Amino acid sequence: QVQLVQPGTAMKSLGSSLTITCRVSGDDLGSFHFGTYFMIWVRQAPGQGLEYMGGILPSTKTPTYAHKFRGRVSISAPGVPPVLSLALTNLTYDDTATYFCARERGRHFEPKNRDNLEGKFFDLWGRGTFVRVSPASTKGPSVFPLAPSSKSTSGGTAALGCLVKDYFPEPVTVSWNSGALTSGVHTFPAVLQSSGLYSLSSVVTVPSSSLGTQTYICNVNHKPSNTKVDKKVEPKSC
Amino acid sequence: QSALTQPASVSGSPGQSINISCAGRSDRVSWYQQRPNGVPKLLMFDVYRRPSGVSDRFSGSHSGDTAFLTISGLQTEDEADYYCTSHPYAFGAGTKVNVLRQPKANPTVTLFPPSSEELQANKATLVCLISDFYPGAVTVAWKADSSPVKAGVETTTPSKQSNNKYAASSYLSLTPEQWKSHKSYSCQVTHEGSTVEKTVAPTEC
Amino acid sequence: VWKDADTTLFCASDAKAHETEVHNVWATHACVPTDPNPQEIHLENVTENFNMWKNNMVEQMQEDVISLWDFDPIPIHYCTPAGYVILKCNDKNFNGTGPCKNVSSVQCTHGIKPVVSTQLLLNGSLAEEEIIIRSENLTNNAKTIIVHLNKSVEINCTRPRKAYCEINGTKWNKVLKQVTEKLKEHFNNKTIIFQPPSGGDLEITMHHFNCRGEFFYCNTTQLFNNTCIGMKGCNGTITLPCKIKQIGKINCVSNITGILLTRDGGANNTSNETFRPGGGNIKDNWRSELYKYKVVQI
Ligand SMILES: *[C@@H]1O[C@H](CO)[C@@H](O)[C@H](O)[C@H]1NC(C)=O
Ligand SMILES: *[C@@H]1O[C@H](CO)[C@@H](O)[C@H](O)[C@H]1NC(C)=O
Ligand SMILES: *[C@@H]1O[C@H](CO)[C@@H](O)[C@H](O)[C@H]1NC(C)=O
Ligand SMILES: *[C@@H]1O[C@H](CO)[C@@H](O)[C@H](O)[C@H]1NC(C)=O
Ligand SMILES: *[C@@H]1O[C@H](CO)[C@@H](O)[C@H](O)[C@H]1NC(C)=O
Ligand SMILES: *[C@@H]1O[C@H](CO)[C@@H](O)[C@H](O)[C@H]1NC(C)=O
Ligand SMILES: *[C@@H]1O[C@H](CO)[C@@H](O)[C@H](O)[C@H]1NC(C)=O
Ligand SMILES: *[C@@H]1O[C@H](CO)[C@@H](O)[C@H](O)[C@H]1NC(C)=O
Ligand SMILES: *[C@@H]1O[C@H](CO)[C@@H](O)[C@H](O)[C@H]1NC(C)=O
Ligand SMILES: *[C@@H]1O[C@H](CO)[C@@H](O)[C@H](O)[C@H]1NC(C)=O
Ligand SMILES: *[C@@H]1O[C@H](CO)[C@@H](O)[C@H](O)[C@H]1NC(C)=O
Ligand code: NA
């Protein structure tokens, strides 16, 4: 019944501060009351691995940190029932990540086999708080042409596209020839760069026989920044 | 506070058996299962001890210096990210386990050089588009001539297309000088033991 | 003509005077008056094995303890019905597992007080002769260790959520010295170290006990810190902070007669050996007294 409760999401601007909390719930026994368990924080950037950043044993007022997070982060746990806190300051785009709280099981007895276990593991986890670090303002995309290439397509076919560079926030919609060109279109998911900005590509596979006479224009729309771009994609000069 | 190495990915059909190594520390090792969009879950602790609720299909083992996790009779439920740690705490890189539900398919790789208009804006982006592969686990490596390039590489998580296969994009940002100073640049995509390498050159029009 | 057996034992107490105390009336409806003729019978040239880590008497006790759990502990005698009898070991320095030379047939066990506590065993029986280290398997650091002392140390608890316990520091250090000495005999003259418990369950990490309706959770960090073994400001009264929890003034003194310990693994290739207080569960508190007894069917 015992659970670690976390807020869920936090939308913050670059350079601001934030304090994530992790409180116990359903603690009918009062096992957490005296802060006997070592409580940790774990970071996980989008599509990356888990990072142990430190923790604290609330019965003591002494937190501990990993080398990477020693001087960058503040951990504590004050309160009648200890509420685990993680204070971040001067948020960067690199701080954009999911933050889990977790308990170290610690010393305990296993009756079924009668074994005294050290409990150097994390049995109980919070749902995680996803912190999003955003720029102070919106940004329109820079659109560049991806000129037709037949090196990786089927016979008598060529692939052309548009590179939609550095925009914020999502989404951006891409059409071709005012929505007249549908088949063969593939708009790839955006990448989130270390700059806090997005970029994506939209590519369309087209008959090589049409490049000479058929115009191809990608229609890019970025509502949040009130930006529209119709970029003509031409064959290269050889 | 010690680096633990894990293989990036491993795959198997339903019923097969696989291994996940935890190089370095074979003492007091814990394993954690993270299904897609899910919370990490304790699978194993003290190298070989299983929590109640964890199937006996999972098994722990050590070989002196390296801990191991065995999954006998793979099932679709096992598809997840597996993370290893010892004491003092420090999570390993992690391993993606893909459980095949359809036949393997290697990626189609399309590499675009920096456009002339982008070069005029004093910028340069190599676009490496990767599609129609399965399972959704690939490694993308860039090369300036023959030597690797880590700086300025931006690669996305692979996501599910309409056909249950996967697509991904990788971008390499360069200066126009870096672009024109090398003989060629290559995007190298590794997938299920197979490699696909496309190469572009500033010389080409 | 006896065999190892398990039978539903019955309790017997010295409960009288129809008190309001819950622990005492329970011994009127479930228990019987103490045996007026408690006679032992020595067995001639009989030697037989024992194993307190598989003794079913511990299970029956606990279950009976839970019943009243559903104020002050009083002694309880555990006896057998017709057809059964309790064997009793009197080898003084018997560690609770192995053959026993001095076997004697008793009708019932002695008066045992169901004192519920952790880390420290309270108001229990003292080991005659030398200190005894007890374990199902010492080499296995995962198995509980019951230290049976041969000299009690008084702990004086006082309550002005605030509370504290007082112990004579000079006396406790003397005892712990002999504990390390006796531990140092089992392993290989290895350096014996005591350390406070790290993170874990509340029962394992702090000395828990009762006091006529008060649940204490005392901090025994100072008690197991090697600042006072082998001088400093250690002599005098140690004051252990405590706390009350509901799962003017008042005082309760008790006899520290045993210790539950857990040995650290990993440190296997080193010269030293670390131990920490707390281990096992409540069943081991009863096991610390029922170690000498064993039921057999006739
Ligand atoms: C006991 O006291 C020590 C010393 O102040 C402290 O480090 C430890 O956290 C305390 N334990 C509990 C359970 O309060
Ligand atoms: C915040 O961090 C950025 C990047 O490290 C730095 O340039 C800036 O000066 C910092 N601002 C503070 C600490 O107020
Ligand atoms: C996994 O490793 C174990 C022990 O090293 C071995 O017994 C088993 O055959 C391996 N399974 C594989 C390689 O599929
Ligand atoms: C208890 O004594 C027996 C011999 O009677 C011995 O075999 C056993 O190892 C001892 N238990 C210990 C040392 O924990
Ligand atoms: C048996 O134990 C008693 C302790 O009451 C002791 O006095 C007696 O000498 C012992 N005798 C034998 C034969 O073990
Ligand atoms: C406590 O121990 C002393 C001697 O160690 C003894 O005289 C006294 O009767 C004991 N009290 C209880 C309640 O066990
Ligand atoms: C307790 O036993 C130890 C040996 O373990 C011995 O040196 C000491 O004198 C004994 N003390 C008492 C009071 O019996
Ligand atoms: C005690 O534990 C050790 C652990 O190394 C084991 O080798 C040994 O067999 C155990 N003893 C018994 C009697 O099982
Ligand atoms: C226990 O401590 C209290 C408070 O210091 C004191 O008043 C009382 O006399 C002590 N009791 C004994 C038996 O020493
Ligand atoms: C505490 O123990 C020491 C050592 O035995 C003794 O000298 C002193 O009198 C004791 N203090 C008391 C009984 O108050
Ligand atoms: C131990 O016995 C004493 C009586 O001498 C009593 O005051 C104390 O409460 C008892 N301890 C426990 C834990 O019941
Ligand atoms: Na490009």
PDB file of C-alpha atoms in Angstrom, chain A residues 28-31 33-34 36-38 57 80 103-109 111 113-118 120, chain C residues 53-54 136 140 142-144 198-202 204-206 217 243 245 247 262 277-281 287:
ATOM      1  CA  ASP A  28      -0.147   3.085   7.776  1.00  0.00           C
ATOM      2  CA  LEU A  29       2.677   1.462   9.741  1.00  0.00           C
ATOM      3  CA  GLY A  30       4.792   4.600   9.994  1.00  0.00           C
ATOM      4  CA  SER A  31       7.847   2.814   8.633  1.00  0.00           C
ATOM      5  CA  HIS A  33       8.288   8.209  10.155  1.00  0.00           C
ATOM      6  CA  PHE A  34      11.784   8.104  11.662  1.00  0.00           C
ATOM      7  CA  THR A  36      15.324   4.977   8.636  1.00  0.00           C
ATOM      8  CA  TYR A  37      15.586   4.344   4.892  1.00  0.00           C
ATOM      9  CA  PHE A  38      18.172   5.786   2.514  1.00  0.00           C
ATOM     10  CA  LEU A  57      19.319   9.127   5.085  1.00  0.00           C
ATOM     11  CA  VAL A  80       7.626  15.187  10.545  1.00  0.00           C
ATOM     12  CA  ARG A 103      13.982   3.899  -1.512  1.00  0.00           C
ATOM     13  CA  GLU A 104      16.966   1.746  -0.657  1.00  0.00           C
ATOM     14  CA  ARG A 105      15.352  -1.310   0.947  1.00  0.00           C
ATOM     15  CA  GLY A 106      18.204  -1.467   3.442  1.00  0.00           C
ATOM     16  CA  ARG A 107      18.637  -3.986   6.241  1.00  0.00           C
ATOM     17  CA  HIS A 108      15.694  -6.358   6.652  1.00  0.00           C
ATOM     18  CA  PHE A 109      14.824  -9.966   7.486  1.00  0.00           C
ATOM     19  CA  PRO A 111      11.373 -15.083   6.946  1.00  0.00           C
ATOM     20  CA  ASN A 113      14.444 -18.647   4.235  1.00  0.00           C
ATOM     21  CA  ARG A 114      15.452 -16.819   7.428  1.00  0.00           C
ATOM     22  CA  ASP A 115      18.156 -14.658   5.845  1.00  0.00           C
ATOM     23  CA  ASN A 116      19.438 -11.292   7.043  1.00  0.00           C
ATOM     24  CA  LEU A 117      19.751  -9.184   3.887  1.00  0.00           C
ATOM     25  CA  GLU A 118      21.786  -5.989   3.503  1.00  0.00           C
ATOM     26  CA  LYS A 120      21.594  -2.655  -1.209  1.00  0.00           C
TER      27      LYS A 120
ATOM     28  CA  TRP C  53      16.739 -23.107  14.873  1.00  0.00           C
ATOM     29  CA  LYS C  54      14.162 -25.766  13.967  1.00  0.00           C
ATOM     30  CA  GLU C 136      22.428 -21.768  12.830  1.00  0.00           C
ATOM     31  CA  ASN C 140      26.939 -17.772   6.828  1.00  0.00           C
ATOM     32  CA  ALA C 142      23.087 -13.996   6.554  1.00  0.00           C
ATOM     33  CA  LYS C 143      22.078 -16.097   9.573  1.00  0.00           C
ATOM     34  CA  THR C 144      21.093 -14.360  12.812  1.00  0.00           C
ATOM     35  CA  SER C 198      22.799   1.714   8.272  1.00  0.00           C
ATOM     36  CA  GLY C 199      19.495   2.075   6.420  1.00  0.00           C
ATOM     37  CA  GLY C 200      16.905  -0.634   6.987  1.00  0.00           C
ATOM     38  CA  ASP C 201      13.722  -1.580   8.818  1.00  0.00           C
ATOM     39  CA  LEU C 202      12.846   0.327  11.984  1.00  0.00           C
ATOM     40  CA  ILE C 204      16.541  -3.639  12.858  1.00  0.00           C
ATOM     41  CA  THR C 205      18.027  -0.146  13.146  1.00  0.00           C
ATOM     42  CA  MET C 206      16.828   0.867  16.621  1.00  0.00           C
ATOM     43  CA  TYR C 217      12.383   3.483  19.673  1.00  0.00           C
ATOM     44  CA  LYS C 243      10.870   8.562  20.636  1.00  0.00           C
ATOM     45  CA  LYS C 245       4.764   6.424  18.622  1.00  0.00           C
ATOM     46  CA  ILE C 247       0.935   2.277  16.379  1.00  0.00           C
ATOM     47  CA  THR C 262      24.316  -9.317  12.052  1.00  0.00           C
ATOM     48  CA  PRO C 277      22.925  -4.714  16.184  1.00  0.00           C
ATOM     49  CA  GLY C 278      19.516  -5.967  15.060  1.00  0.00           C
ATOM     50  CA  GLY C 279      18.692  -9.190  13.247  1.00  0.00           C
ATOM     51  CA  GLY C 280      16.063 -11.869  12.747  1.00  0.00           C
ATOM     52  CA  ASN C 281      12.540 -11.186  14.138  1.00  0.00           C
ATOM     53  CA  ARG C 287      14.338 -18.825  20.759  1.00  0.00           C
TER      54      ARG C 287
END
